[PDB]
Amino acid sequence: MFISVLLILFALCVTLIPEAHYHMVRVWSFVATIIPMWVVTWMWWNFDASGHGLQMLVILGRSHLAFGIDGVALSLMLLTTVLFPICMMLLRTVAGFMTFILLEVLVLSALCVLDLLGFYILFEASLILLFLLIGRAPYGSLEAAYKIVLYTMAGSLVLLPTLFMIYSECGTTNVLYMTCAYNHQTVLGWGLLAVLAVKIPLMPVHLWLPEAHVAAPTAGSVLLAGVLLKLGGIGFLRFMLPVVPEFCVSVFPLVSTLCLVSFLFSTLSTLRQIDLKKIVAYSSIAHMSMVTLAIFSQSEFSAYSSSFLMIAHGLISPALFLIVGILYDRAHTKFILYFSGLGASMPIGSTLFFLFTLGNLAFPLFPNFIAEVLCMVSIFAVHELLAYVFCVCQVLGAAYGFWAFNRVVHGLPRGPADVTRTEFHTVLPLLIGAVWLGIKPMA
Amino acid sequence: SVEERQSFHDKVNDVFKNLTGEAGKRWARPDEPILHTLNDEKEEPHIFFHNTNYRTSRKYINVEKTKILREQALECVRAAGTARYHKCTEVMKRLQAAVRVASNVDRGPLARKRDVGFIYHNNRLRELQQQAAELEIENPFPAPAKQATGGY
Amino acid sequence: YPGGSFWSEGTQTGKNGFLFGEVPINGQPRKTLWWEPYWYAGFGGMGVGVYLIYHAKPLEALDIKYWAAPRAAKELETEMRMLDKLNERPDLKERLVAVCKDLNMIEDEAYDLVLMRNEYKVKLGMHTGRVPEDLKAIYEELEA
Amino acid sequence: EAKQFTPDGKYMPGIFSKAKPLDRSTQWVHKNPYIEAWYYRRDHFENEFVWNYRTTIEALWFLGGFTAAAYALSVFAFRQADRRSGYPKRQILGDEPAMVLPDERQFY
Amino acid sequence: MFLLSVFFPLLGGLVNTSPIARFLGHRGSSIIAIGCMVVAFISSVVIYYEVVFMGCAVSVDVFGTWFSVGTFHAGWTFNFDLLTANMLFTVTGVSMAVHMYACDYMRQDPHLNLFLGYLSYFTGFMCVLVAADNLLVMLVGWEGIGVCSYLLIGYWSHRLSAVKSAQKAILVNRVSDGLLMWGVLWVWYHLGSLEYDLLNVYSASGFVGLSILIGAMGKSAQILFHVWLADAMEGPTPVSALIHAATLVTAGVYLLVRLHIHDEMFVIIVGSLTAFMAGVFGATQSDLKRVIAYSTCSQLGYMMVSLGLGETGGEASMGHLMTHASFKAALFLAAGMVISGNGGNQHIARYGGSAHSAMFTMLTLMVASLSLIGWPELSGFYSKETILNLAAICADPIADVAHTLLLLTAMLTSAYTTKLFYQCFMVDFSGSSVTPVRNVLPILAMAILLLDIMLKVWVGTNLLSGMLFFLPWGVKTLPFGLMVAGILTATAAVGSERFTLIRFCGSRWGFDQLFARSPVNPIFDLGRITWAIGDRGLLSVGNLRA
Ligand SMILES: CCCCCCCCCCCCCCCCCC(=O)O[C@@H](COC(=O)CCCCCCCCCCCCCCC)COP(=O)(O)OCC[N+](C)(C)C
Ligand SMILES: CCCCCCCCCCCCCCCCCCCC(=O)O[C@H](COC(=O)CCCCCCCCCCCCCC)COP(=O)(O)OCCN
C-alpha cells in the first residue's frame, strides 16, 4: 500500500519534467512501468501456495477499496505488468505516456479489489481515457470510441442498481460477506451478466470490439486485447460465481447458447474479413467464448484452465497486433491486397508471424494448446456434445489463420523491409513467455 | 431459536478471535473440519472458511493419491509384460477407484458423475436385462459386460 | 563447384545482409539505443526472478501438490492394507455394500467408500446421522 | 544519394537538402483508387442492409434457426447431465420452483 | 543410445535452420544433415536389436512433467517397446537415404540448408510421435509432422498451386485432428490415464473407436480424406518420398495398431473401399508421381483392413507398413531421377528408351516395382500375401467382400505399375531432353533402400513369416495369377472404348469438385450471412440524427 503510493507518485512525476529534455522523459516513463513488473514478481515470490486462498490483504476502513491476492489475479497482474512497458515503447508523446500510466494504475487496482463498489469505481473510471485514446483526432475514429464507451456505460448502468440492492440487503459490498449472506440472486445475477457480457465480447453485445480494437493505435490494441477483455473473466471468477451461484446454475443453458453462437458466428465472420487488423480482432471473440463456457462449466478445475487460457490469449494476440502494427507503421496500410511475398522481404517478421499464427490456432508447444485441452476437459465433464461443438469446428479457425498468412507472406515480394532492433524487442518478451508456458509451465 | 443461534455465533466469533497455532502447522491447512448441525454453513463465516480450507486440502490429496497409484500400476504392467492380463487387474482397479473418488467427491454443481470403470453403465445394463426378462420382451440393449477395461 | 571440387574454399566475404538494417558508420561500434540498458535490466531481472521462484522457493511454498504428496502416501499405505483385508473378509464386504446401498452407491463403489473415509461429507454425515452408524465400525475392523 | 549521418554518428534531418531523405514514409504504398473505394465500401456495409426477401429468409433460417438449435442442445445437455448425476429435475430460468445447487452433505 | 534416435535429427534441423548455418553454407550444411541422420540410424539399429529380438523394453523420463491439472496428467516420457522400435528403425533408415538423396537433388536450389533443416525437423517430430508413451506427447508428434508437412509441401512458395496444396493438407487433416482430440477426451474420461500401457479396452462407448478411426483416416488418407494426398505432389521429390514412406501417412495406421480399440466393420469397409478406389484412380493417371501417390493410398487401405482382422492382423498390418516404406521410398527416388533425366517432365507419354537414366535407376524402379506387385519371394510378397490369406479365413461375412476388393486391387496394381515401367523404358523415345543423372549420392541412396528390401526377405518383420495358414492351392496362388494378368494387360497396352467411364475414373470420381461446393462454398456464404446480415444488419444499432 505504501509501495503502491510511492509507485503512483513516481509515475505521476512525468508531467513535471520539462519537455525539452527528450531523453529524460523517455527514460522516466519507461522506468515508471518497469518498477511495477519487479514488484509483482516479488509478490509472486512472497506467495504461499499451500496457504490461504486470499493473501496480502489490506482494507481501507469504511471507504470500500479492499484488496487481496489469489492465483487468477496474480497471473493477470503479472501479464499486465509485462504488457505495459511494451506499450511505453510504442508511444512518442507525454499525453500517451500519462494516459497509459493512469490506465496501468486503474487496471492493477481493479484486478485485485475485493469490493464490488470498488470494482465499479476502479474499472470504468478508464472510460474517458479509452474514448480519448481511440478517438484521437487525425488517425483515430470517433465512431469506434463512441461505440465502446456507450456499450460499456450501458452494461455498467444495468449493474449499478443491483450492486446497491445487495448493499442495502446485507449491509456491505465486501465479497467475503456478500458470499455468506442471503440475497435475491436473480436481480444481481442479471446485473453482473450485463457488465461482464459486454466486457468479454459475447454476442449480441459485441459490436464495439471490431471497431475499437482496429481504430486504436498499436499500444492501445495491445492493452485492449491482452488485458481489458480479461476483466470480464476475472469478474466472473471473483464476484459472480461466489455471490450468485444459484443464478449461475439456472442461467447455464442461456450462457451456453450465447457462448456457442458467439464462437460459431464470430469464426464464420472472420473468414470474410479483408483487413489484417480486423482479422486479428475478430479471432479474440471465439477464444473468449471458450473462456466463458469453461468458467461456467464449474466442472473439473475450471478456474485453473480458464485462467490459463486467458494468459495464453493475452500472450499470443498482442504479438499479432504488434506485427500488424509494424506493417501499418512502415507501409501506411492494413489492407491485405497491398501485401504479398513478405517472406522474401521480412524473413524475421514472417517467421514471428508464422509462430504466433500457430500459437493462435492452439498448436502444441504453445500455451494455447494446453489451455484449450484443459478447457475442453472442463467442458466435456458436463456433457460430451458441448465439447464436440468446439472440437469439430477447428478447421474453421485454421482456415482463416492460414489463409491470412498465405495471402500476405507468400507470392510476389512487395512490401517493407525487415524488423528493426526496437520492433524485435517489442515482440521478444511475449515469445519467451510463450515458449516457457507452452513447454514447462509448472513445477 | 434466534437467541440460541445468536449465542452460538458469539461463541464462534470469540473462539476464532483468540486462536493461534505454531510449530510447523499452517492455519488454512486444518487437520479436522468443524462439525456442525447448521442449516446452511455460510450462516457462520468462520466455520465456512475453515471447512473450505479442509475441503481444498482433501481435493489436492486425492489428486496426489491418483498419481502415486498410477506410478505403481505402470510399474506392475511394465514388469508383467504379456502376463499383465492376469497379474495387474487389482492395481488397475485401485487406480480407477482412486480416480473415481478424485473426480466425484466435491464435483461442483453441474458436472455429471464420472465412471472410470464403465461400472454405472454395466450395472444399468444388468438392471435393464432383469427388467426386460420380467417384461418378457426382447432386450433392445447390449448384455452387460463382466469387465470393460483393464481394471473394471 | 567453385575450384573444381566440393572441398574448395568459399567465395563470399563481407556482410551477408545487415541484421536489423544496421550498417556500420566509419567502422565505429554501434551506438546503444536509449531503451537497451533499461530493457535488459527490467526483463532480465524479471526472468531471473521467475527462475528463482521456480528453483529456490521451498517446495510446499511453490506448489500445494508438494504439501499433499507425502500426506497422500501414508494414507495410501493405510488404505492398501484395508483393501487387502476387504478382499479376504466377505462379511465386512457385504456390510460395506449395505452401507453403499444406503448412500446411493452401487456394489462396484465399495473400494471408493474405503478411499473416502477422510472426506468432508463422510465426517459430517457420521456426525449428523445421514451416514449409517456401521461404517465407522467397518473402518475400525478394516484398519485393525 | 542523401547523407543523413555524420562520420561520427550524429543524425542530420536534411530539411533544406536537395536529395530526398530516406525515412519512415519511404516504403508507404501507392494507393490504388479502386482498392481504396472497395475497402471504404466494405467498411461502411451497414448502409447496404435492407429488409428484402432474401435477407429476411436467411436471417430467419440461419441466425434464428441455429440460435434455437444451440438453445435446444444446451437444455438437452443440462438435462442429461442432471440425469446421469442422480439429480431430479432442476430449475432453469422460468421453470417453476425446484432444486438448484446440490448439497455437498448429501449423497445422490 | 536410446535418446539418440529421437533428439538428434531434431538437433540437425535446429543446426541447419538457425544462424549457425550462416557460417556453414550449403556445403557444410549437407555434411551436418547427413551425419546427424547416420548417428540416429545407428542408434535405432541398436534399439531394434535390443527390443525386437531380445525383448527388453526401455522407459525414459525425459523432461519431467509437461502439465498436470487435476487428474489430467501429461508427462515428457518415452517408452521403447516392440512397435516403437519397429517404427524408429523404419523412419530413421528411410530418412537417412532421403537426406543423402536431397543433398544432391536440391543442390541448385537457392535455400538448400533451409530445406535440409525442414526435412530433419519432420523426421524428428515423427520420431517423437512413435517414441511417446502417452497420448499428449503423441499429439506433439502428430501436429509437428502436420506443420512440417505444410512447410515442405509449399516450399516453392512463389507458385500458388503449391501454397494451396499445403493449405489443403492442413485443413483436411484439421478435421480429423478435431475428431482425434475428442476421442482422446473420451479415452481419458473413461479410463483415467493417458499412458498406452494403462489403456486396455474390452468394451467401450463406440464414439471412442469411431472418432479415433476418423482421426487416423485423416493422416493415413483413407476414403473422403484422400483428397489432400494427390495434391501434395507440388512439393519436391524428397518431400514426397518421406511423406509416402516413413512419415505422416503411416502415423494413423500406427495409432490404430497401438491402441486396438476399433470396431472392425467400419475399419474393414473403409480400408477395402479405399484400396479399390485408389487402385482404379492410379490406373487412369498419366502424371508419374500421382500414380505412385495413389498406390500409397491403396496399400494404406490394405493395412487398414488387416488391422481390422485382429491381433494377428494388427501384426501383419505393422509388417506391411515396415516393408512398404522401403520400396515406396525407392520408387519415389527412382521416379525423381527419371524426371530429372527428362528435363523436369512428369508426363509418362514423353519418356522411353534407356538413355535418360542410369542403369541403377532402372534397376531400382524394377526391383521396387516387383516388390510392390507381390512378385514371389521378394519383400512385399510376404506381407501382402499374409494380409490376403488372413482375409480369406475371417469369420466375419463383411470380410468376404473385402477380400474380393483386395484381389481386384491387386490386379489393378500390377497393371499400373507395369504401365509405369513400360512407358518409362520399353517404348520408343518421345521426349526432348536427355540429361541422365549418375551422381554418387543418389545412387547410394537408392542402393540402401534396395538393401533394406533384401533384408526384409532375409530377416522377417515378425514371426508370421513362414507360418502356414492352411489354404488350398487355388486360393493360395491366385494373387500370383492376378499379378501376371496385370503384367500381360499392361504390356499389351490395350484400352477400352467406354470413354465416359474412362473420364469418370481419370477425373478421380469428382471428389474435389463436389467438395468445392458441398462444404466449402456454403462455409463462405454462411460467413457472408453472419457478417453482413448479422453484425452489420440485425444486431447493428445506428445513430440518432439531430
Ligand atoms: C487459479 C489458479 C491460478 C492458475 C492460473 C494460470 C497461470 C498461467 C500459467 C501457469 C503456471 C503455473 C504455475 C504453478 C506454480 C507457480 C506458483 C503457484 O502455485 O501458483 C500460484 C499463482 O501462480 C501464478 O501467479 C502464475 C503466474 C503465471 C503468469 C505468467 C504470465 C506472465 C509472464 C509473461 C512473460 C514474461 C517473459 C519475461 C522474460 C523476458 C497459486 O496458484 P495455486 O497453486 O492454484 O494456488 C493455491 C490455492 N490455495 C492457496 C487456495 C491453496
Ligand atoms: C519453434 C519450435 C522448435 C521445436 C524444438 C524441438 C522440439 C521440442 C519438443 C519438446 C521440447 C521439450 C524441451 C524441454 C526443455 C527442458 C525441460 C526439463 C527441465 C529440467 O530441469 O529437466 C531436466 C533437464 O534435463 C536435461 O535437459 C538433460 C540434461 C543435459 C543432458 C543432455 C543435453 C541436451 C542435448 C539435446 C540435443 C538437442 C536436442 C533437441 C531437442 C531433466 O531432469 P528432470 O528434472 O526432468 O528429472 C526427470 C529425469 N531425470
Structure description:
- This is part of a larger assembly, with chains A (443 residues), B (152 residues), C (144 residues), D (108 residues) and E (546 residues).
- With 152 residues, chain B is mainly alpha-helical.
- Chain B has five helices and no strands.
- Chain B is 59% helix and 0% strand.
- Chain D has a two-stranded antiparallel ribbon with strand order 1-2.
- Classes of the chains: A mainly alpha (443), B mainly alpha (152), C mainly alpha (144), D mainly alpha (108), E mainly alpha (546).
- Chains in contact: A-B, A-C, A-D, A-E, B-C, B-D, B-E, C-D, C-E, D-E.
- The interface between C and D is small, with 13 and 10 residues.
- The complex binds ligand PC7 and phosphatidylethanolamine.
- The ligand CCCCCCCCCCCCCCCCCC(=O)O[C@@H](COC(=O)CCCCCCCCCCCCCCC)COP(=O)(O)OCC[N+](C)(C)C sits between chains A (44, 47, 49, 51, 53, 71-72, 74-75, 78-79, 82, 303-304, 307-308, 311, 429, 432-433, 437, 441-442) and C (43, 46-47, 62-64).
- Phosphatidylethanolamine sits between chains E (7, 10-11, 61, 63-64) and A (365, 439-440).
- Chain A: One of its GO terms (molecular function) is NADH dehydrogenase (ubiquinone) activity.
- Chain A: The chain crosses the membrane at residues 1-21, 27-47, 71-91, 93-113, 114-134, 148-168, 187-207, 217-237, 247-267, 279-299, 308-328, 335-355, 362-382, 385-405, 423-443.
- Chain A: One of its GO terms (cellular component) is mitochondrial membrane.
- Chain A: It is found in: Mitochondrion membrane.
How would you summarize the topology of this molecule?
The structure is cut from a larger assembly and holds chains A (443 residues), B (152 residues), C (144 residues), D (108 residues) and E (546 residues).
Chain A: H1 2-11, H2 22-46, E1 55-59, E2 66-69, H3 71-88, H4 94-111, H5 116-123, H6 127-134, H7 142-170, H8 175-178, H9 185-199, H10 208-215, H11 218-228, H12 230-243, H13 245-250, H14 252-270, H15 276-297, H16 302-331, H17 342-345, H18 347-360, H19 367-380, H20 384-392, H21 394-409, H22 421-439
Antiparallel strand pairs in A: 1-2
Chain D: E1 5-6, E2 9-11, H1 33-43, H2 53-83
Chain E: H1 7-17, H2 21-53, E1 58-69, E2 72-80, H3 82-105, H4 112-131, H5 135-153, H6 160-191, H7 207-219, H8 227-231, H9 237-245, H10 251-259, H11 264-282, H12 288-309, H13 311-341, H14 359-372, H15 379-391, H16 398-426, H17 440-458, H18 473-476, H19 478-492, H20 499-506, H21 511-538
Antiparallel strand pairs in E: 1-2
Helix pairs in contact in E: 1-2, 1-4, 2-3, 2-4, 3-4, 3-9, 3-13, 3-17, 4-5, 5-6, 6-7, 7-10, 9-13, 11-12, 11-16, 12-13, 12-15, 12-16, 13-14, 13-15, 13-17, 14-16, 14-17, 16-19
